[PDB]
Design a protein around this ligand. Structure first.
Ligand code: CLA
Ligand code: CLA
Ligand code: CLA
Ligand code: CLA
Ligand code: CLA
Ligand code: CLA
Ligand code: CLA
Ligand code: CLA
Ligand code: KC2
Ligand SMILES: CC1=C(C#C/C(C)=C/C=C/C(C)=C/C=C/C=C(C)/C=C/C=C(\C)C#CC2=C(C)C[C@@H](O)CC2(C)C)C(C)(C)C[C@H](O)C1
Ligand SMILES: CC1=C(C/C=C(\C)CCC[C@H](C)CCC[C@H](C)CCCC(C)C)C(=O)c2ccccc2C1=O
Lengths: 126, 742, 42, 69, 170
């Protein structure tokens, strides 16, 4: 229901379950918002002692993170299967709109790094 | 969405009560034994589900869970093969010297002197030499250590536990409904796309990322413990681009359709790898990728839930012409309501595929160092020929069970089955004539040659040095296949197989493969093959076509698929059932497959296998005697059976003495079978009467009254011990011979 | 223990397989500790 | 080895042509389903464009093989 | 209905509070497929072994009997395996486990609680209320200890330091 603009040219809603689609969109929105905030913040400041994916995997940070995220996702998969079997509203609309916005902005930031090898905020400053 | 998942929850209660009640599954057997026949009848009919239950739903549920039980057994078997390779094998020593060490993964305990079976297989190891070709599989996979073999064994155990759990769950907790099983379009889409297509694609991915780098390093000569672990190829893309520089470009050439970038590791070489004598693994990787692509494409043909696709019923009903009446109408209903019809088709195809596997794996050796391991080549050819022959005869067994039981004339009016049954005399008389013509002009050539050679007339023989029967069509096909590289397969570099012609491939001075020339002896034994196959088809087809009725017995379907006779009248109707044509056709399958494996063994020893001495000359195991000695029966008796049984009969006191004992034991079991085959039930019941009298005299008669075996069971026991003895005698003869000399 | 599982273990094939495996097994053990007894030692 | 080419707008042209060709063919030959505005849905579009990528991949590779590119 | 422990997940339907320590946490759903009595006995047995083991690891570093040579506890296993002392411990554990099989049958019949071996030598549990507190506590200590076991066995593998020394160090 939140984030409804009646936008379905390809009419995907009819041929796939709405609960899975909306849950998938909200999960993508959350991941994107976190990633875009992380990309700007990380340029602002560095965590102590710490393309970046490669350094991280060599460091081993990604592998431990993958195990803990995977555990949350495995517990979550039971929940998503259960859903498939069977002013707060304004906050939901803000959550979906900001997430969609990040899903566009973050994609831009990563592709910007391909072209210029720069972080998004520094690129503008330089 | 008429293709949907539908399940009954908690259908059957997981109880031990019926375990304690043998025979619970049928109304006849559930009331307990009164004669010993009950015991045999219990085992004979137990997996005959459609004989216990009327409903297709319960039958389908039983079949699905029993297939999970079979998978659990196969996974346990594979896990044990990996564990015995990991723990009780010389695999690590064999990796260093594949041409010197003999594979061995079975060690015996010392009890009654049986530790003589732990022969010196090489690599500081003692054990029973194994011929299943697992070592070459593991080297092709890129295993390189016993630790990875322990992890494969654990993966097999986990899969075995999951399959036995799935069989229990899907019979006792969540059993699908009949409408789930009757989804032939969905099942074919998933089994082409999902099972076969993603099976090939995932294996191609493993070959590319693990098998290719590890085996390139092995064939370069790097020691196995010096080779990087398989995941360092996955991560360090630079290390992979060292061996295969195309990896420097990643997956952009795949997606942009610039596929000729990948020619480093996706080749079309053909021929064999000179170092290992096996197929180029870059070719197998490209082969599995291409097979994956068109299995995933083929699994999109049939219609499931969105309007795109074919209806298999419409395809079948549309193919009808002027000779064949209503055509394929009603075949969809047959194949979606009868499990026996499906099993008849799938068993005939699986048996044919196993026979093709036997030919293709000796001629185009796929694994590294399997071509010069002659015990493995002979073992896997012989093994897959026997699996093929058995499965083909079970295809005709279940075609007969369908015709007797699941066939309904009302739903099969004027279609292809109705018309076959309505001219079965023309089919069986023409097949009968062909089998007579083809036995006279194939085996009669052998008898003509025995007579001429015995009479001193060698100019009157069918031979290369006399009247010649050359296989010109087979020779011409061999010519075309040697001319194909650069001509009709222009981008291939070598021939598909050196059996067609070309070079001699030698690995460790032993021939991997070399051209298999065809002469008069090859013409004769190929027509022997066509004769034995045509006769086996005659017996099995006559059983299927006359399963319901004959001119002899007009109501054979009321007696069933398996009945012994319909009395001594009409002159005698012994062995008139469809079961008795499967019984008689398994003898002729045995005859056919025995001649095929003898032809392979003698021809490969005489004309292919052996050692390459200096100057490129090849010394074969039996020195090229096939050409001038496989044209007479005396030649097969003397130069093949008599000459090559030397190793089994001289094996006593060595590590091959087990084969000498099994040679004799199988001769025994084979002869013992003739007691059941040449005899009749009435004699044995009258003998049992006097034995019962002696028990009554001592007051020790049993309450389960002893009976002679049924007529059908006397036939089944005779056939089982006949096949066990004959195959066992050949198994021992083949293995001791080729282990000693090859 | 379940009485129906024990009634299953009392069936003829289970008892036959267990009894002849136990029998074969003490023949094997007796020939491990006391091998090559061609004669009763006397 | 058959000669393939790095992706250019010509490769794109072939792909686009094949996809559109199959979209129109699918409007004509798909037996179970405003020439393109009647009964046109996602499975029809996804099937005609899947056949477009199969026909287009074959056409691109063949035209690269013979020299048309 | 929803599980108390995790709000988004649903209450399993076999976890109705029948057994102490139930918070509704069963995402995989094994409780539905299998008898819960077996699982509760297994949970107590695994936990009791783990609780003893974590104490044993710590104590062995703190104090060791003089006759046996002092060794790292993780690697002590191998020395006892060859010595025969480890075999003696297994044999006695197996002997008690044999009686445990009979007790498992008693549980299935309904004559026994899942983890009740009637062990009250010191009579710590005076009344039902203190026993209830203890059984919930035992469940929590068992669960936490199962996590804690392998907590520093795995740490030992990454860093060759005694857990007590490791705790102080770095
Ligand atoms: C599935 C195929 C398979 C096959 C054919 C074999 C065959 C063999 N294995 Mg291997 N093994 C396998 C899988 C397999 N194994 C797997 C999966 C593992 C991993 C766990 C192993 C691990 C393994 C080890 C570790 C060893 C063997 C050994 C052996 C050998 C002797 C076994 C023996 O006599 O013990 C007999 C043992 C008994 C306890 C006798 C039991 C007899 C009972 C009565 C059989 C009854 C079945 C029962 C009645 C079924 C009904 C149940 C009931 C409820 C009614 C023999 C070559 C030994 C070897 O090679 O030593 C050099 C050895 O030490 N195996
Ligand atoms: C992609 C879907 C898919 C796949 C892979 C299979 C696979 C199989 N089916 Mg089929 N099946 C499917 C869909 C599928 N089915 C559908 C949709 C239906 C309903 C119409 C059926 C109905 C059906 C029946 C009625 C029967 C089968 C049977 C079988 C087995 C055939 C014997 C064989 O080759 O197993 C050996 C080959 C293997 C590869 C063993 C694999 C074991 C697992 C189950 C395969 C899949 C694992 C997983 C997806 C892979 C994860 C990859 C991950 C590591 C990345 C095989 C496991 C028969 C059987 O044996 O039942 C048990 C049988 O009787 N299936
Ligand atoms: C998609 C999200 C994402 C990903 C994959 C990464 C991944 C990484 N970051 Mg970036 N980062 C992120 C978000 C992300 N970060 C955010 C949101 C911030 C702002 C706080 C930062 C700020 C940041 C800095 C300043 C630095 C990194 C660094 C790193 C690397 C080392 C791991 C680390 O210390 O991260 C730690 C990141 C965090 C603690 C932020 C976590 C914030 C979210 C909310 C965590 C939620 C966890 C929670 C328990 C899950 C809830 C589940 C749900 C059911 C409710 C690694 C490549 C370091 C590096 O190697 O760069 C050189 C480094 O110096 N990141
Ligand atoms: C969530 C992200 C995060 C956070 C909060 C920290 C926090 C810290 N790291 Mg870093 N670190 C991270 C991610 C992170 N790390 C990642 C992703 C890696 C690579 C895998 C590292 C690798 C790393 C190294 C190599 C070291 C640290 C150290 C430290 C500590 C020193 C802080 C400092 O300079 O105070 C300064 C304080 C004072 C001068 C006075 C008070 C501090 C607790 C240092 C440390 O103490 O190691 C034990 C250190 O040497 N970190
Ligand atoms: C009683 C049945 C039986 C037994 C005991 C064996 C035993 C053996 N087989 Mg054989 N096999 C059988 C039936 C049997 N086979 C049948 C019916 C077929 C025809 C499909 C084959 C085809 C076959 C092949 C192609 C190969 C073996 C190999 C082997 C050996 C290694 C086993 C292994 O790990 O497989 C390992 C198998 C592989 C690594 C590759 C298998 C690739 C095939 C194409 C997989 C197909 C699976 C698919 C679901 C089947 C579809 C059938 C089709 C009609 C639809 C061993 C001697 C292997 C061998 O000779 O090694 C020296 C080998 O390469 N078997
Ligand atoms: C199911 C089978 C399967 C699986 C799981 C994988 C998995 C993988 N492949 Mg392989 N691959 C496969 C089949 C498979 N492949 C087949 C059939 C081919 C032939 C077309 C290839 C050809 C191939 C190449 C050429 C490369 C991979 C690479 C990779 C990795 C992907 C990294 C990436 O996206 O960046 C890829 C790099 C980009 C620039 C994009 C990953 C481990 C890459 C890798 O990491 O190599 C180790 C890589 O370079 N694959
Ligand atoms: C996928 C394969 C497959 C499947 C599922 C079936 C399934 C079935 N068949 Mg078919 N069949 C098959 C293959 C198959 N068969 C093949 C390959 C042949 C050719 C031989 C036949 C020939 C055949 C006939 C002729 C008949 C069946 C019958 C049956 C049904 C009853 C099974 C039963 O209760 O036997 C119970 C199982 C046994 C009694 C096992 C004993 C069999 C042998 C003698 C033991 C094996 C010896 C062993 C391997 C080696 C011993 C080692 C030694 C040294 C000690 C059942 C529907 C019967 C029926 O009436 O169907 C309606 C029937 O009459 N089948
Ligand atoms: C304009 C379109 C176009 C062109 C020029 C080609 C041209 C060619 N294709 Mg392609 N192809 C096309 C469309 C096209 N195809 C389409 C639409 C498909 C369906 C996806 C394919 C699928 C296809 C496959 C799957 C293969 C070819 C192959 C070939 C080549 C050799 C055929 C041959 O002589 O075998 C003669 C062989 C005989 C048995 C004939 C006697 C040839 C250059 C083959 C090849 O070698 O390509 C490298 C090959 O394997 N084509
Ligand atoms: C494909 C994913 C992608 C997304 C979704 C995306 C979204 C946004 C948004 C959305 C909120 C803004 C406001 C934004 C801003 C700019 N982008 Mg970015 N952008 C993406 C990728 C690329 C590429 C491939 C290029 C590029 C460019 C520019 C330039 C001009 C600079 C110039 O013309 O040189 C500006 C102002 C170029 C470049 O990176 O130059 C450094 C160029 O080639 N972007 N971009
Ligand atoms: C029942 C019965 C009786 C009895 C009895 C007995 C023998 C009772 C014994 C009970 C015991 C031993 C309980 C121990 C629980 C241990 C836990 C919960 C683990 C905590 C560790 C944590 C949280 C950690 C950690 C960490 C990790 C992993 C690694 C480190 O780097 C870091 C860190 C240290 C933080 C008696 C006979 C008295 C009578 C009575 O009538 C009935
Ligand atoms: C010997 C013989 C018998 C009698 C055979 C009997 C009674 C079988 C003897 C079995 C005894 C009772 C047990 C011995 C079984 C073996 C030790 C191993 C059997 C292995 C499987 C049975 C499990 C017939 O009934 C018969 C009927 C029709 C044609 C030919 C014959 C025939 O030749």
């Amino acid at each position: 229901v939140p984030g409804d603009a009646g936008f379905d040219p390809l009419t995907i809603s009819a041929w796939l379950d709405s609960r899975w689609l909306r849950e998938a969109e909200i999960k993508h929105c959350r991941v994107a918002m976190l990633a875009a905030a992380g990309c700007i913040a990380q340029d602002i400041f560095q965590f102590p002692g710490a393309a970046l994916h490669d350094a991280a995997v060599k460091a081993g940070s990604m592998g431990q993170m993958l195990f803990w995220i995977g555990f949350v996702e495995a517990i979550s998969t039971a929940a998503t299967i259960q859903m498939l079997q069977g002013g707060r509203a304004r906050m939901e609309l803000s959550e979906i709109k900001n997430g969609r916005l990040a899903m566009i902005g973050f994609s831009g930031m990563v592709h910007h790094y391909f072209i210029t090898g720069k972080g998004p905020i520094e690129l503008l400053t330089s | 969405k008429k293709v949907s998942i539908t399940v009954d929850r908690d259908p059957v209660a997981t109880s031990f009560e019926k375990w304690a009640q043998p025979g619970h599954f049928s109304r006849t057997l559930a009331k307990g034994p009164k004669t010993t026949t009950w015991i045999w009848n219990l085992h004979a009919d137990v997996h005959d589900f459609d004989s216990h239950t009327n409903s297709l739903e319960d039958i389908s549920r039983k079949i699905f869970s029993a297939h999970f039980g079979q998978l659990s057994i196969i996974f346990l078997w594979l896990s044990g093969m990996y564990f015995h390779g990991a723990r009780f094998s010389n695999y690590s020593a064999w990796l260093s010297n594949p041409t010197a060490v003999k594979p061995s993964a079975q060690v015996v305990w010392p009890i009654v002197g049986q530790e003589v079976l732990n022969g010196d297989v090489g690599g500081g190891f003692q054990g029973v030499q194994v011929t299943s070709g697992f070592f070459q599989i593991w080297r092709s996979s890129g295993i390189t250590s016993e630790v990875e073999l322990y992890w494969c064994a654990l993966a097999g155990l986990i899969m075995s536990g999951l399959m036995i759990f799935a069989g229990w769950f899907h019979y006792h907790k969540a059993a699908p409904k009949l409408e789930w099983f009757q989804n032939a379009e969905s099942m074919l889409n998933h089994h082409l796309s999902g099972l076969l297509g993603l099976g090939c694609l995932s294996w191609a991915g493993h070959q590319i990322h693990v098998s290719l780098p590890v085996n390139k390093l092995l064939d370069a000569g790097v020691a196995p413990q010096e080779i990087p672990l398989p995941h360092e190829f996955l991560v360090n893309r630079d290390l992979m681009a060292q061996l295969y520089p195309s990896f420097s470009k990643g997956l952009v050439p795949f997606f942009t359709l610039n596929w000729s970038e990948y020619s480093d590791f996706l080749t079309f070489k053909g021929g064999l790898n000179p170092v290992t004598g096996g197929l180029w693994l870059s070719d197998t990787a490209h082969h599995h990728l291409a097979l994956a692509v068109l299995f995933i494409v083929a699994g999109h043909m049939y219609r499931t839930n969105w309007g795109i696709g074919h209806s298999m019923k419409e395809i079948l009903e549309a193919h009808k012409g002027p000779f064949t009446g209503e055509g394929h109408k009603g075949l969809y209903e047959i194949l979606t309501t009868s499990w026996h019809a499906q099993l008849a088709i799938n068993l005939a195809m699986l048996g044919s595929v196993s026979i093709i596997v036997a030919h293709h794996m000796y001629a185009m050796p796929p694994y590294p160092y399997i071509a010069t391991d002659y015990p493995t080549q002979l073992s896997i050819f012989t093994h897959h020929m026997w699996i093929g022959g058995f499965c083909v005869c079970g295809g005709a067994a279940h075609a007969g069970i369908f015709m007797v039981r699941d066939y309904n004339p009302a739903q099969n009016y004027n279609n292809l089955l109705d018309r076959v049954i309505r001219h079965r005399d023309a089919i069986i008389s023409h097949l009968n004539w062909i089998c007579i013509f083809l036995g006279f002009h194939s085996f009669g050539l052998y008898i003509h040659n025995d007579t001429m050679r015995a009479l001193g007339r060698t100019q009157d023989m069918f031979s290369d040095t006399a009247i010649q029967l050359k296989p010109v069509f087979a020779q011409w096909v061999q010519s075309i296949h040697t001319l194909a590289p650069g001509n009709t397969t222009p981008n291939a570099l070598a021939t598909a197989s050196y059996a067609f012609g070309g070079d001699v491939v030698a690995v460790g001075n032993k021939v991997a493969m070399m051209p298999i020339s065809l002469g008069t002896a090859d013409f004769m034994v190929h027509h022997i093959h066509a004769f034995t196959i045509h006769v086996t088809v005659l017996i099995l087809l006559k059983g299927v076509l006359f399963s319901r009725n004959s001119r002899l017995i007009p109501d054979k379907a009321n007696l069933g698929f398996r009945f012994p006779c319909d009395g001594p009248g009409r002159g005698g109707t012994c062995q008139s059932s469809a079961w008795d044509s499967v019984f008689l056709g398994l003898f002729w399958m045995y005859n056919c497959i025995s001649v095929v494996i003898f032809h392979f063994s003698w021809k490969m020893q005489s004309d292919v296998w052996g050692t390459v001495q200096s100057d490129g000359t090849v010394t074969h195991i039996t020195g090229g005697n096939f050409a001038q000695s496989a044209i007479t029966i005396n030649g097969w008796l003397r130069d093949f059976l008599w000459a090559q049984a030397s190793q089994v009969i001289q094996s006593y006191g060595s590590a091959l003495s087990a084969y000498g004992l099994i040679f004799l034991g199988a001769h025994f079991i084979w002869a013992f079978s003739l007691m059941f085959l040449f005899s009749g039930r009435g004699y044995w019941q009258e003998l049992i009467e006097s034995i019962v009298w002696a028990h009554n005299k001592l007051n020790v008669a049993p309450a389960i009254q002893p009976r002679a075996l049924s007529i059908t069971q006397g036939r089944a026991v005779g056939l089982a011990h006949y096949l066990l003895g004959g195959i066992g005698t050949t198994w021992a003869f083949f293995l001791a011979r080729i282990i000693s000399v090859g | 223990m379940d009485s129906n599982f024990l009634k299953y273990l009392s069936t003829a094939p289970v008892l036959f397989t267990v009894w002849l495996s136990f029998t074969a097994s003490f023949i094997i053990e007796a020939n491990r500790f006391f091998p090559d007894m061609l004669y009763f030692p006397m | 080895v058959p000669q393939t080419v790095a992706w250019s707008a010509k490769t794109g042209a072939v792909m686009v042509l094949s996809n559109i060709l199959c979209i129109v063919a699918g409007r004509y030959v798909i037996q179970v389903k405003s020439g393109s505005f009647a009964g046109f849905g996602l499975p029809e579009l996804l099937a005609s464009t899947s056949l477009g990528h199969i026909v287009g991949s074959g056409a691109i590779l063949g035209l690269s093989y013979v020299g048309v590119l | 209905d929803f599980s108390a422990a995790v709000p988004f997940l649903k209450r399993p339907s076999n976890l109705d509070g029948a057994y102490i320590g139930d918070v509704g946490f069963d995402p995989l759903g094994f409780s539905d497929v299998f008898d819960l009595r077996v699982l509760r006995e297994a949970e107590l047995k695994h936990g009791r072994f783990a609780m003893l083991a974590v104490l044993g690891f710590i104590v062995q570093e703190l104090y060791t009997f003089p006759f046996f040579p002092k060794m790292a506890p993780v690697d002590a296993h191998d020395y006892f395996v060859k010595q025969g002392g480890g075999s003696q411990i297994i044999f006695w554990i197996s002997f008690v486990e044999l009686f445990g099989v009979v007790a498992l049958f008693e549980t299935l019949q309904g004559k026994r609680e899942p983890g009740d071996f009637a062990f009250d030598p010191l009579g710590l549990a005076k009344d039902e209320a203190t026993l209830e507190r203890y059984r919930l506590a035992e469940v929590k200590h068992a669960r936490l200890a199962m996590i804690a076991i392998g907590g520093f066995i795995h740490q030992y593998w990454v860093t060759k330091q005694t857990v007590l020394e490791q705790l102080g160090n770095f």
